[PDB]
Amino acid sequence: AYEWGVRSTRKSEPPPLDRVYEIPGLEPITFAGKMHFVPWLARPIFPPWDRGYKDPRFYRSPPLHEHPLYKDQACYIFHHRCRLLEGVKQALWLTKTKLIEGLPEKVLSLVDDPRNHIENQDECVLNVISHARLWQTTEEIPKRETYCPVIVDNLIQLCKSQILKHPSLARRICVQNSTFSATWNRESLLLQVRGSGGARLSTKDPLPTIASREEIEATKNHVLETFYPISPIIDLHECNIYDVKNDTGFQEGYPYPYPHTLYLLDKANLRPHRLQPDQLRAKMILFAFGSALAQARLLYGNDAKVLEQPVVVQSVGTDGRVFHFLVFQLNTTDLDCNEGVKNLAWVDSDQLLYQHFWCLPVIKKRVVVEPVGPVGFKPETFRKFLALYLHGAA
Amino acid sequence: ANFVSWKSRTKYTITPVKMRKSGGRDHTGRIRVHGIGGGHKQRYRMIDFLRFRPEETKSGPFEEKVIQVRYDPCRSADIALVAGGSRKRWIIATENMQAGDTILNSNHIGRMAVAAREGDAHPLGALPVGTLINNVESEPGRGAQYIRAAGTCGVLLRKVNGTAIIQLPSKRQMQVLETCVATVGRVSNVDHNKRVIGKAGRNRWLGKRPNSGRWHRKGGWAGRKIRPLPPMKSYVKLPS
Amino acid sequence: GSLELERVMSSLLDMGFSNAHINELLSVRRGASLQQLLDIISEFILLGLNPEPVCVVLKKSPQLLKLPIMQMRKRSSYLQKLGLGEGKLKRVLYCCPEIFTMRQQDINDTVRLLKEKCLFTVQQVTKILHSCPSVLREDLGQLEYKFQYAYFRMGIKHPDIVKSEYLQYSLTKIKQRHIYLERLGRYQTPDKKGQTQIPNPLLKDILRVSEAEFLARTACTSVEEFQVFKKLLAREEEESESST
RNA sequence: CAUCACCUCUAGCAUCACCAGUAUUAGAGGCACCGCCUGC
C-alpha cells in the first residue's frame, strides 16, 4: 500500500558505526574524552542517560502498557467533543431507549393556562434576544461564542422571576463546570460517558415520573433500529487506559443531588466546529442518560434491573437560535440485552426562537428595508422552555 | 535551501491537512516545473486508494455506506466519505454515487463471475469481461494508481491464466494479475472536460501561471533538425 | 499426467480455439513442454491475437513454441509498449516471423532511429511497423538513406511517407524511377519555400504502379529507353560507392 | 507579450519539484475567443 510520510521528513538513519568497533579485542579511540566532536576521531557510543530526579517541566510518562489502569478490553468514551455519525439513531441504540416525538402532555399542560405566563412575556423575550445579539458588547456584531451563553442565562433568569407565583422554584440552583460519569455494557461493549460543560439545573426533589407503569411495560415490543454496516461505537474515543467508576459529580451530602435540566451550548464561531442539529440531539440524549444513570446507580446500587421508581432528567440544547428539548426517563439499568424494558425519550427538534437577527438596518437604494431586531420571532418556542423549567414546581 | 516537504503526516485521517504550495520549486529552491504558482489556498484530503483494507479486528469482505460525495481541490474527480464499521475514510467517487448508498469491498474470487455494481471493489479475477473499471493497481497490495482522473474508465479486455488485460484510457493495454482489486464503473465528474475557464483570471485561480512570452521556434519537428547525408546535402535547398 | 493433459485442452477451450486447432496445436509442438506450450499460446492470446491467426503462425514456424518463457513475456511487454497489439501484430507476424527471435536491441535501434534520427511521431512509428514489417530486417544505414532520399531529394514530408507505404519498397527501384522522372523533367524538387514549378507525380503513381504501366502513365517513354537508363544508373551508383 | 478557446508534441507512473497527482492527467509548444468557411 501507499505509506504516509515521505522519507525526507522522517528522521534520518544514524551514520554507520566506525569499523574500529567491528574488530574484537580492540578499544576504539573516540572524542568522548575531549567532550566535543572532531571528524578525525571515532564516534563514541553513549549509554542511555537518566535525569536522576523528578522534574515536572521535563517529565516523560511510562509506556502505555505500563500504566496501572491498563485493560485489554477497550472502553469507548463519549464526551462533549464526540460527534456521532448517525446522530439520534446511534444515540438511541447505545442508551436502549424509544423515541417519542413531542414533549409530554403533563409538561406542556403547565404553561397551557394564561395564569402561569410571564407578564409582558412577548416583550421580555424580544429584549433578551435584542440584548444578546445587539446590545451586549461594544462591537456591532458579537460573535456566537459571546451571545450563545448569555441568551440562555437571561432566559433562565427570566423564568426564575416566577418564584412569586411558584414558591417551589426556591429549591433549585444552576451549577456550572459540573461533570458526571456513567459506565454500562451494550452487547459486550464497555461504554462510558463523561459529560462536562454547560449548565446543570439541580433540585432538592427528584423529577416525577412521566410515563405510567403500563406505558413503560409496552416498550418490550419495541425493537431498536440498526445502522449496519456502521458500528454503534463509531466516532467514540476508544481508550484502553480507563477506570470504571460511577460519579454523580458531587460528594455525599450535597443539598441539590437530583439533576433537573442540562443546558448544552454550541458556542463555536466556526460552523464546522458547531454540532449539527441531528448530532446535537444525540449529545443531549447521552448526557441525559449519563446523568440519570449515575443517579440510578447511586441510589439503587450497582445492579442491573428494571427500576421501581424511574428517574426523569430533562435537557435543553441550543445553538443560540435553534432550540432542542429533551425529556429522558430511565426505566431500566440492565442494558446488556436488547430485549425487555426500554427507556423513553421525548424530543422536540428544530425549535426556532427567531428566524434571523439584523444587527444593522438593511438600506437598499436609500430605503430601510429591514429594521434592527429579530425576524420571525416565535413566542411558542419559549413556552416549551418555560414548561420544562416549571416542571416539578407547579 | 531549507525546504521541508509538508507530506510529513504518518497517520491517516479524514481531517483536511493544510499543505504549502511549491511554485514549481524543488528542494534546492530553483524552478524545476514552469507555470506553477499562486492560486487559492487548498487543504489536502488524504485518499485511501486501497479500497480493500479490512480493519484491524476484522478480515475478509466488508461493506461501507457512503456518507457524502463532495468536491476535492487537489484532484479533478470528486471524492466520497464512506464509513465501514468503526472508521471513516476518503475514496474516489464514481459517476453514480449518492449519500446513503452501500458499497462492497471484497477479495474473494468465485468460480463464476458476479454481478458487478458501480462503486464496489472486487478482484480482477471475479469481474465480467468488458466491464468498465477504474482505480486499478499493478499488483496486489500496491494501491490504485491508474485510471484515477475524472470520468476515466478502463476496459477488462480479457483474462487468461490468472492475468488480465486492462485497456487504459490512453488506449494502451496493460497486463496485471487477476488478484488486483479494481472499482467497477467510471469516475465522477464525467463532464469535467466540458468546463470553460472563461477568462485568464480563472487559470490563475487554479495555481497556473501564464506561459513564457518567448517565441520558441523549437518544437517536436521544427527544433530538431535531421542531419542531411553528404549525398543528400546537395539537394537540401534549390534556388528559385 | 492426466491433469496436465486435461488443463491443456481445457485452457484452449476457454480461449475459443476450434476443435481442429486444439488437436493441431498438440501436433505442432516438437518436444515442447506442456505448460511451456500453454504459455506461448496464452502469450499470443494476451496480445489480442485471435485463435485462428494463432494456429496459422504456429503452423508455419515451430520455433516460437521452443522459446524461453521469460524472453517472450519480456518481448510481449515491449511489443505492446510500442503500440503493437490485436490486429496490428497479425500483419507483422506473417511478414516478419523473425521478430520474436531477433535481439531486443536490434528492434530498439530500429524504432529509435525512426523516432530520433528520422523524427517520426510515435503514432506514425506504430503505423509504419504495422504496415511495413520489412523495416526491422532492413539495415539501419540503408533505411536511414532511404528516408532522407524522399525527404530532401524528393520533397516528401513525414505524414505522406507513412501513409504512402514508402519504406517498404526497395531502395534501388526508388532510385531508378525517381531519377528517371527527375531527369525527364516531370518531377521538380521542391525549393526552400517548398513550392514546385510543376505538380510532382504522386508517390503512388511512381512506386505502386508496375514498371510497364508506370512509363505510360507519367514517364511517357518507351520500355527500351528505361532499360538503358537502369544500366547507366547502376554504373553511376557503382562508381559512386567506389568514389566515396 | 500574455489571454480564455483551439491545436501540436511527449509521458502508463509514486515517498523532496511534477505530486502526496495518474491520459477528462501532467509537461513542452503554436495560435489568440466565439461564429462561418476549408484541408484530410
Ligand SMILES: [Mg+2]
Ligand atoms: Mg499555452
Ligand SMILES: [Mg+2]
Ligand atoms: Mg507565444
Ligand SMILES: [Mg+2]
Ligand atoms: Mg499576440
